């Protein structure tokens, strides 16, 4: 069958698909038409129906997996449209992780003779992350950071070596936030989580601004000024608060200026979008910093799709973790940040 | 002069006023009319102008302070109306703390010959808290907790002994959140803070519901169902997530169901108010829990005015700290929770 790895999250389904490229003359004959048509459909389209997308730029080319050479493909669509995915399948071993592997188990079984193997999300994320870093991003680093994150004239994306990755704090920002401590390839745990995550950004921003997509929310936020909504340290003290090392620009109360009716009447939708993004992103950074201190881990890697096409939040995390930790913690990012669970599930295939 | 302690916060001014009750015959004669009129005005009114309130139920009666017997009074008004307060003063040694002692320093000095003594907010809060607990609340406990916080048929307010208070984690929920670690009467520090505090609750709730006061926001929240807005663990997994001990009712993504347009069209204002309260309160509890673990402190006391007339948030904190800590942390509350800085400032008077 086609080799697939699926992570069914609270918001998106992520799918990794291994396309063989070493198909012999005999294998091509012995392959049934439906399998030929699935392969052509997946490799000859970048958009699938109305909501499916192949992230072509992430493709890993000429990988050797399970004794075959192939290309690894990365595909996403909304969990809301899984019934359409399953219906098209009804007209194969599926390794699946994420909460939806449980919630939608019975739906996958409406595909006759399909074997569903639910795999642990922690195992899948950690194995997928370590695997992609080990094989590299077509010879480039999978892991990167923002150098001189405090100085905008210098701040630039730079590669980071993870060849000895342990220990590692993984902050998975999806609908919510989960925080993992990875001490070895076989010693890792979920530390905690927070409910202020990507779904909070999109849900609040939609209520506050009427935006109808993640990308629209980010474009609004890119034009806004969060200080129109937030109450800063300088608004309370008149300036910096030296005694505790709090700069005047630090947010003392997110949305705290919105207690005043006249300020609510003057704030723009873009300002509210940016305040929502800043609020969620700073809270994630601060929770990550507290967990890193408790776990005694100084490398913090952020994954999930909250950070897809979201350089604002990445740069805010890079600057804030470095600033508030006095340079003791480093924010790290991964090119394949949304897909590690899906890859880890795919890598579970030989165990069945 | 009258003895006053003032904490000028980002949202409210809190004032503690010592009313002497041992005034002799000679002292009553030697007292000037304006001082007699300030004392009568303060003790014969419970509302001052349109926004000032004396919290009569908090009054400490027949306290011995600075060698005199008197009553200690607790008064609050919005920082927005400090210009009215200062203008009425212009028609005394002032010990003042909070960010506004700095921001409004020059305004207080428009009162001729007034000496303003700015005092450190950390010193004032800790000294005020320890003092009020030491003298008691008219013979009753100043400190209380909710017994059997996990079982609603049993959960009830009960007194808690702080006669040996150290160590103590103090979580001051005002406009924002500050977290203090108190190891001794002379060894204490600010641990960190978060910007998701009372101002975030009121500001977001005002944007989302059109409420025009803190009390109205709480009344709305009391009637709402936060699960109409929040995405729960059971919404993602179909049920509990046993592998990590996450119950199905835990919030996986605050406001996370608001990414769906049809759900935004069906949610009520009351539901949004409750989701805002739950979101802010759970984040505060979780940050407090992480800080308590890092500080190795198992008693967490919550202060500030976010919890005034707010039993929902108190009970949510009590239950959540006990549940998520597997009973290792205890949430503690104080009757005078909004006023400790103001008292600590007053207690600084003899140093001048
Ligand atoms: C391994 C992996 O990636 O799996 C996916 C995953 O875990 N998703 C997920 C993300 C976030 C959550 C929320 C959460 O963890 N909690 C626990 C801690 N909470 C509190 C609340 C109050 C207090 Cl006082 N203390 N703690 C809030 C709720 C739940 C599931
Ligand atoms: C002693 C006392 O009661 O004084 C009153 C008082 O302190 N008020 C106050 C309350 C809260 C604040 C906010 C805050 O402290 N921070 C520091 C930590 N932050 C982050 C952000 C990102 C990351 Cl990665 N890490 N940390 C966020 C901003 C500032 C002032
Ligand atoms: N195309 C998108 N649609 C919806 N959310 C997106 C999209 N792209 C990025 N996001 C962001 O990513 C978050 C979901 O990331 P993800 O890691 O896939 O979460 P989950 O595993 O819970 O589905 C959303 O809450 C949103 O903030
Ligand atoms: N009467 C009120 N007016 C405004 N906010 C109130 C009021 N009563 C309680 N609150 C809550 O208390 C918070 C302010 O508490 P407080 O400890 O006095 O903060 P600060 O010291 O920053 O002024 C507000 O953000 C709000 O959530
Ligand atoms: Mg996920
Ligand atoms: Mg305050």
Distance, in Å, from the CA atom of A277 to the CA atom of A222, rounded to the nearest integer, reads 10
The reply to whether A2-140+339-352 and A141-224+268-338 are identical in fold is yes
Q: Do residues A285 and A322 lie in contact, with contact meaning Cβ atoms separated by under 8 Å?
A: no
Query: In this structure, which ligand is nearest to the CA of A205?
Result: 3
Closest CA to A16 of A29, A8, A26, A4: A4
Q: How far is CA A240 from CA A37, A245, A255, A294, B202, in A?
A: 64, 8, 19, 28, 25
Please name the method used to determine this structure: X-ray
Sign of CA dihedral A138, A142, A148, A153: positive
Cα nearest neighbour of A243 on chain B:
B120
Q: How far is CA A326 from CA A37, A309, B163, B292, in A?
A: 55, 28, 37, 21
In this structure, the residue with its CA closest to atom 30 of ligand 2 is A252
Cβ–Cβ contact B241 with A under 8 A: yes
Separation in Å, CA of A339 to nearest CA in chain B: 18
H or E element in which residue B108 lies: helix B105-108
Closest CA to A204 of A279, A259, A267: A279
Cβ-Cβ contacts under 8 Å for A254 (sequence gap 6 or more):
A229, A230, A275, A278, A279, A282, B176, B195, B196, B197, B199, B200, B203
Choose the closest CB to A264 out of B207, B238, B250.
B207
CATH of domain B141-224+268-338: 3.30.420.40
Q: How far is CA A199 from CA A194, A207, B236, in A?
A: 12, 12, 12
**Whether A99 and B238 lie within 8 Å, measured CB to CB:** yes
Q: Is B98 in a helix, a strand, or coil? A: coil
Cβ–Cβ contact B9 with A under 8 A: yes
Does domain B225-267 correspond to CATH entry 2.70.98.60? no
Pairing, β A231-232 against β A60-65 = unpaired
- Fold type of domain A2-140+339-352: Nucleotidyltransferase; domain 5 (3.30.420)
Cα nearest neighbour of A119 on chain B:
B243
Cβ–Cβ contact A228 with B under 8 A: no
**Does the beta carbon of A198 lie inside 6 Å of ligand 3?**
yes
**Range B103-106 contact pairs with CB under 8 angstroms and sequence separation of 24 or more:** B103/A236, B103/A237, B103/A238, B103/B8, B104/B8
Q: Where are the domains of chain A?
A: 2-140+339-352, 141-224+268-338, 225-267
Q: How far is CA B343 from CA A188, B17, B199, B307, in A?
A: 48, 9, 23, 18
A vs B, Cβ pairs < 8 A, gives: 205
| Candidates B11, B197, B204, partner chain A, best to mutate (most A CBs within 10 A) | B204
H or E element in which residue B127 lies: helix B121-135
């Amino acid at each position: 069958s086609p080799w697939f790895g699926m992570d069914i999250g609270g918001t998106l389904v992520k799918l990794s698909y291994f396309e063989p490229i070493d198909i012999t003359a005999e294998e091509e004959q012995e392959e049934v038409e439906s399998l030929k048509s699935i392969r052509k459909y997946l490799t000859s389209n970048v958009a699938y129906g109305s909501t499916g997308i192949r992230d072509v730029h992430l493709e890993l080319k000429d990988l050797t997996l399970f004794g075959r050479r192939g290309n690894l493909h990365f595909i996403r669509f909304p969990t809301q449209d899984l019934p359409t995915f399953i219906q098209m399948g009804r007209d194969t071993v599926l390794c699946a992780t994420g909460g939806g592997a449980y919630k939608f188990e019975k739906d996958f079984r409406t595909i006759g003779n399909l074997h569903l193997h639910k795999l642990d999300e922690l195992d899948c994320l950690v194995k997928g992350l370590l695997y992609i870093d080990s094989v590299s991003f077509n010879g480039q680093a999978e892991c990167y950071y923002f150098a001189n994150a405090s100085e905008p004239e210098r701040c630039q994306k730079m590669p980071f070596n993870l060849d000895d990755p342990y220990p590692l704090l993984v902050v998975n920002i999806g609908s919510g936030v989960s925080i993992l401590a990875v001490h070895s390839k076989d010693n890792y745990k979920r530390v905690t989580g927070t409910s202020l995550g990507g779904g909070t950004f999109l849900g609040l921003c939609s209520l506050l601004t009427g935006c109808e997509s993640f990308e629209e929310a980010l474009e609004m936020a890119s034009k806004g000024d969060s200080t129109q909504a937030d109450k800063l340290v300088r608004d309370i003290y008149g300036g910096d608060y030296e005694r505790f090392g709090l700069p005047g620009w630090a947010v003392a109360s997110s949305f705290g200026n919105m207690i005043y009716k006249e300020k609510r009447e003057s704030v723009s939708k873009e300002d509210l979008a940016r305040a929502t993004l800043v609020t969620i992103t700073n809270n994630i950074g601060s929770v990550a910093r507290m967990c890193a201190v408790n776990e005694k881990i100084n490398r913090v890697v952020f994954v999930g799709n909250f950070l897809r096409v979201n350089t604002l939040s990445m740069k805010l995390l890079a600057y804030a973790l470095d600033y508030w930790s006095k340079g003791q913690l480093k924010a790290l990012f991964l090119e394949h940040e949304g897909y590690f669970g899906a890859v880890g599930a795919l890598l579970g295939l030989p165990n069945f």
